[PDB]
Every structure is written in structure tokens, then in C-alpha cells.
Design an enzyme around this catalytic site. Structure first.
Site, mmCIF file in Angstrom:
data_model
loop_
_atom_site.group_PDB
_atom_site.id
_atom_site.type_symbol
_atom_site.label_atom_id
_atom_site.label_comp_id
_atom_site.label_asym_id
_atom_site.label_seq_id
_atom_site.Cartn_x
_atom_site.Cartn_y
_atom_site.Cartn_z
ATOM 1 C CG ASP A 159 -1.830 -1.206 1.260
ATOM 2 O OD1 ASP A 159 -2.899 -1.126 0.625
ATOM 3 O OD2 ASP A 159 -1.493 -2.230 1.893
ATOM 4 C CG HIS A 187 -4.909 -5.912 5.810
ATOM 5 N ND1 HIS A 187 -5.754 -6.261 4.777
ATOM 6 C CD2 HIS A 187 -5.399 -6.522 6.916
ATOM 7 C CE1 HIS A 187 -6.711 -7.045 5.238
ATOM 8 N NE2 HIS A 187 -6.521 -7.218 6.534
#
Ligand SMILES: NC(=O)C1=CN([C@@H]2O[C@H](COP(=O)(O)OP(=O)(O)OC[C@H]3O[C@@H](n4cnc5c(N)ncnc54)[C@H](OP(=O)(O)O)[C@@H]3O)[C@@H](O)[C@H]2O)C=CC1
Ligand SMILES: NC(=O)C1=CN([C@@H]2O[C@H](COP(=O)(O)OP(=O)(O)OC[C@H]3O[C@@H](n4cnc5c(N)ncnc54)[C@H](OP(=O)(O)O)[C@@H]3O)[C@@H](O)[C@H]2O)C=CC1
Lengths: 327, 327
Positions: A159, A187
């Protein structure tokens, strides 16, 4: 000159493993001067496929691959392990609810957390990639008596890298000139990519991009990137995920660049007021195998709000596993 | 930092490409201080998938990736290319005999050979991986007058690496202690893995293993290795093939280790009595972009016979393609 270190990897015959193992053996994760012994784990029914993976690794004739072992027993795979990448999680079964998924993972990570505490090096560094990463890491360290909870981490590096890529594309600058990017929290979709402290060539990012773009384009695009890959290739982003896992371990072991930091989901100790225990992504610097959360950063309402939202999702997930008696 | 070099790769969205591109962008092929510009080519129907691969590459935030472009036009993909890895070949679909396959590959490599001659750097280094590698390379260079034919090569490095792995396993020594392995001829089954000049820790290989094992176990196993991977994993050995492709270019562009050599299929100039023009695998040493066949090696009857057989197979393939008007 350096003695070999043992690297254990689960879900070894899966997609991430296929994009991960070869680069580790090539020395891209722990250094081109660091020999590695790969101890691979798979479920019994994937052992044949894991043997195929073993043969491919042998067929690369890697000078740094000091040893190679495949097994379906966590106690064998984690034996004297210096590093452990927990990639294998519960498969998405049909007619299976979210909660049901949690119980399967609960069994997987409680067992692996126990195995680690029993046969791995006491200072074994753990990275959880199998989803849901943050909560699986929580289950693992809570079930790993005698081991350092802080050595149990979860990945948010993909990410993080994705955020850097988007900022680079927007500003027209090389991704190599982007630093101090931060991804906070889980996440998942509540993850918060932070541009308030990021810099492009040393200049604040928000001096180059406006808030509307940041809120209405940047954030949603980073969160949906995984789905975009799937819609285009027809398969998940295993290669970029493997790269992020490698960088996560790499920077943790070898260190972060001076003046920069990276994102890692780690057990909270109350930094920024984040509840203790939950594995939360924070901006961190590392040196000599130890990481430290970057504290002292100014947090405005916009960031505060998003940081709390993701924290609450993590608290909720933690509540669920506690109820299921997993911790 | 060296000025960026342009690396063209075809069949970019396929399995080999997926295991190849990230390591190239990471600097594994041309060095950690050599920036690269990836110019990717795919067939029109796979352009969406290629965009997905492009996104995964961006998401790795590679500091050496100075440029990234996807296209379905060979003149665009090969424009000013310093290196060209021809991976994409004709897909074998039901209802196609050898002749049918050769026809489509013929058109593919005649077009790419012409495109390279028209827009690539004059000294562009070309590696053909798409099968049949040797013959596709022949079609490519014969249709690229204006370009050095010796710059068109075919891969045998995977076979080479597989041979080293088997010898290491048999003698129980690290693969890093195996040198002077040779694979002669065609990429196919008639491919000949030579153990007569190979050494294990400095000792002649045939001093540690006997001829019975060499002929009845070693040769067949190296030849069937690709099929063994497919039977175990259920998919082709794309990762180990990508690795071999990287080493092939790497050892060519940078150089081979002192006192050792590697295997490369290149246009014959009469070495060892091999017919001129056919792309044949030879033992070779290389330095900064230039290779040379290791001539003067003592060749026994066991090796001669096999070198002759694989050479005849290449001659026949050459005649087949000549009769189809491809060369
Ligand atoms: C073991 O491993 C195999 C099953 O593995 P397979 O299905 O190939 O799994 P993958 O290697 O693709 O996925 C393994 C784990 O990583 C997670 N993950 C996190 N980020 C990514 C990403 N960008 N792309 C892909 N996965 C990601 C997956 O979560 P998620 O479920 O959300 O994809 C999953 O828990 C079986 O052979 C079994 O025996
Ligand atoms: C373009 O390129 C793509 C075709 O990709 P896809 O079908 O995935 O192909 P692959 O990447 O698996 O194969 C591409 C080429 O490499 C050859 N090859 C040589 N050695 C190996 C090996 N060890 N493993 C795999 N291939 C090997 C294949 O020959 P072979 O036919 O013998 O596999 C084929 O010509 C499509 O996207 C198309 O649009």
C-alpha cells in the site's frame, strides 16, 4: 564470510511464494553477501506442487542458497528460523462467512505462533502477509509465549509503495525522489495513506497537489489498486506483493534511508494514542534489525479522523477473535 | 549512474514475463547502478493484461526504472532498444501441425527481425526465448540484414543451469562449486549436456560420476526437467526460465567468471565443425557485450555423436523454414 540465516516461508507453493522465493534466494532480501537456507511449508495437499517449486529453485543455481527444505510440519519449517514470512492463510471457501474465515485462520496462526515459540530462534523476525494480516499477526504473537511480540509484524508496504507511485505519477517526478510516505492502520480499505509529511524532492507533497485530489482521487485509488490489477490481468498482484514483503523484511534488517521512513504494521504500544496490542501500521525507521515508530508528527483533524476509523476496525476485529477464544 | 538503457521484452504479459520484468527492473540483469527503461510488447488482445503488469511494476517503486511503456507495435517496442528479449512466440492451439506453427512463428520473427533492424540500436543485444528458440533466432537475424547476426542469440541457459544442479546433487557439493558445464546444440531434447570439461571443486566431473549414470540418468533427467516441473506444479517453469534469461543477458553484457564459461546458442561460424548460419549452443566466455566460443576443447566420440545429432536436427529445421520461404 557470513554464516547462513534460516528463512521460513509458508504457503510456499502459492502465487506470492512463486514471485517471492526466487528473489530471496538471489539475495535481494537480506543482502548479496548473506547466504540463506529456505525452509518451506505447505499444506499436505500442496506438497507435490511445493516439490515443483523446490526443483525450480535448484534450477536457478543460486550461489547464496545454502540449503533448501520442504515440509508440511510447522515445527520443521520454523526450526531455528531467523526469519519467518507467514504467507499461507485460510482459502476463501464457498458458502463461508467472514467470521468462519476468522476461525480457520485462528487455527492456522495459533498453531504457527506456537510452533515458532517452540522451535525458532528467540529473536525470529516475523512478517504476516496472509490476510487479514494485522489480525493474523495479533493471533500469532498472542499465541507465541516467550517470543518478543514486537518481532511479529504485518505488511502494509505494498500500500505504501502504491501510494508513492501515485504521488510520483501525479507530480511527474521519479518515485525515487519521494520519501516520508505513510500508511496508517489496517491492511484493509480503512487503511490511511498520509501525504501530510511526504516530500517530493524535499518539498511538502501538499504544496504540489491539492486536498480535493488527495481526498477524492489519491486515497480511493490506492485502496482500489489491488482490484484494478485483478480486473486488468485477471489475477492478483502477487509479484508486487512479493516485492513489498521483501522490502518490508529488507529495510527492517538492513535499515531505512537516512531522513526517510517506511510503513510497517506492528504491535501498538500506545504511540499516537493508538490502543495497545493491535497490530497497526505506523511510519517507522529501522537500524540493525530493530524498528522504532516515528513519533512527534503533527496530526490534524483530517488524519486524526481516518487514523481512529482504521483503529476502530482493528479493535472490532480483535473483539471478534477474542470472542472466538483465539486470544 | 549510467545513462538509462532501453530493454524491450515481448510477450510481456505472459508467464515468463511475469517472472522476468520485476527482477530486471530491480537491477538483477544489468547491475544495481544501471537504470533501465522497459518497453513492453504484447498482442492486441493482451494489452489490457499488460497494463495490469505495468501497474504492478509501478507499484514496486523501483529506483532504477527510468521509463516504462507498453505497446502492441514492434516498431515502438524496439525503438532505440539496447536489449531485446523475444519471449512471445506462436501459441499452439488445437488444429495445428509443425508446419502451421512454423508459419506463424515465421511471420512473428520476420516482422520483429525487420522492426529491430529498422528502429533498434545497431548494437542491440537480442535473446530469443520463444520456442523453437534456435530456429526463431535464425528467422529473426536472417530477416535483420544491417544488424550483426552474432547479436541474435537463443537461450539454453536453463538447460545449462539444470545440468549444474543435477551434478551438484549427485556429487553432494554446492552448485556454486560447479563450473565449465556445457550444453550444445538445439534447445530441444537432442540438446547435449557435456560433462567432459565440467569440474566439481576443481576436479573433473567424470572422476566423481560414471558414464552409466551420465548416459542413463543425467541426460534424460535434464531433458525431462521441464515436464517434471509441469507434473509437480501443474504449470510451466516460468520462474527458473526467467532466471536463465536474466543470466544469459547478464553474463553477456557484463561478463563470465574467470576460468569458467556458460552456454549460449549463437549463429555458427564453423566452430567445432558446426554448419555455418545455424544458431547452435556452444560453450562461451563473454566480456562487456561480446562473447567468444571456447574453441580447442578435446571432443570425444560420446560427445561428437550427440553434437552431430543435434546439429542435424537444426539443419533439418533450417531446411523446413527455408522451404516455407521464411529465409
Ligand atoms: C497454500 O498456498 C496456496 C494457496 O495460495 P494462493 O491462492 O496462490 O495465494 P496467494 O499467494 O496469492 O495469497 C496468499 C495470501 O496473501 C494475501 N495477499 C495480500 N496481498 C496480496 C496481493 N496483492 N496479491 C495476492 N495475495 C495477497 C492473500 O489474501 P487474500 O485472500 O485477500 O488475497 C492470501 O492470504 C495453496 O497451494 C495452499 O496449499
Ligand atoms: C504474448 O505472450 C503471451 C504468451 O504467454 P504464455 O502462454 O503465458 O507463455 P510463457 O511465458 O509460458 O511462454 C512464452 C515462450 O517461452 C517458451 N519457453 C521456453 N522455456 C520455457 C519454460 N521453462 N517455461 C515456459 N515457457 C518457456 C515457450 O515455449 P513453449 O511453447 O514450448 O512453452 C513460449 O514460446 C501471451 O500473453 C501472448 O499474448
Amino acid at each position: 564470510m557470513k554464516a547462513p540465516v534460516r528463512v521460513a516461508v509458508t504457503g510456499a507453493a502459492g502465487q506470492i511464494g512463486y514471485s517471492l522465493l526466487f528473489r530471496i534466494a538471489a539475495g535481494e532480501m537480506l543482502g548479496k553477501d548473506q547466504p540463506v537456507i529456505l525452509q518451506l511449508l505447505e499444506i499436505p495437499q500442496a506438497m507435490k506442487a511445493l516439490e515443483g517449486v523446490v526443483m525450480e529453485l535448484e534450477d536457478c543455481a543460486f550461489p547464496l542458497l545454502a540449503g533448501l527444505e520442504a515440509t508440511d510440519d510447522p515445527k520443521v519449517a520454523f526450526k531455528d528460523a531467523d526469519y519467518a514470512l507467514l504467507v499461507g492463510a485460510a482459502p476463501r471457501k464457498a458458502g463461508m462467512e467472514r467470521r468462519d474465515l476468522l476461525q480457520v485462520n485462528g487455527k492456522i496462526f495459533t498453531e504457527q505462533g506456537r510452533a515458532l515459540a517452540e522451535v525458532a530462534k528467540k529473536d525470529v523476525k516475523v512478517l504476516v502477509v496472509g490476510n487479514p494480516a494485522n489480525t493474523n499477526a495479533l493471533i500469532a504473537y498472542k499465541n507465541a509465549p516467550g517470543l518478543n511480540p514486537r518481532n511479529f509484524t504485518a505488511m502494509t508496504r505494498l500500500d505504501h509503495n502504491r501510494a508513492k507511485a501515485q504521488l510520483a505519477k501525479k507530480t511527474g517526478t521519479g518515485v525515487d525522489r519521494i520519501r516520508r510516505m505513510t500508511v496508517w492502520g489496517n491492511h484493509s480499505s480503512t487503511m490511511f495513506p498520509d501525504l501530510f509529511h511526504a516530500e517530493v524532492d524535499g518539498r511538502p507533497a501538499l504544496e504540489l497537489v491539492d486536498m480535493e485530489w488527495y481526498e477524492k482521487v489519491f486515497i480511493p485509488t490506492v485502496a482500489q489498486r489491488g482490484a484494478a490489477i485483478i480486473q486488468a490481468r485477471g489475477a492478483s498482484s502477487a509479484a508486487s506483493a512479493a516485492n513489498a514483503a521483501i522490502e518490508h523484511i529488507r529495510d527492517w534488517a538492513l535499515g531505512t534511508p537516512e531522513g526517510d521512513w517506511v510503513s510497517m504494521a506492528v504491535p501498538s504500544q500506545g504511540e499516537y494514542g493508538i490502543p495497545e496490542g493491535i497490530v497497526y501500521s505506523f511510519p517507522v525507521t529501522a537500524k540493525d534489525g530493530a524498528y522504532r515508530v516515528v513519533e512527534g508528527l503533527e496530526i490534524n483533524e483530517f488524519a486524526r479522523k481516518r487514523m481512529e476509523i482504521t483503529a476502530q476496525e482493528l479493535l472490532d476485529e480483535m473483539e471478534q477473535v477474542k470472542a472466538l477464544g483465539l486470544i
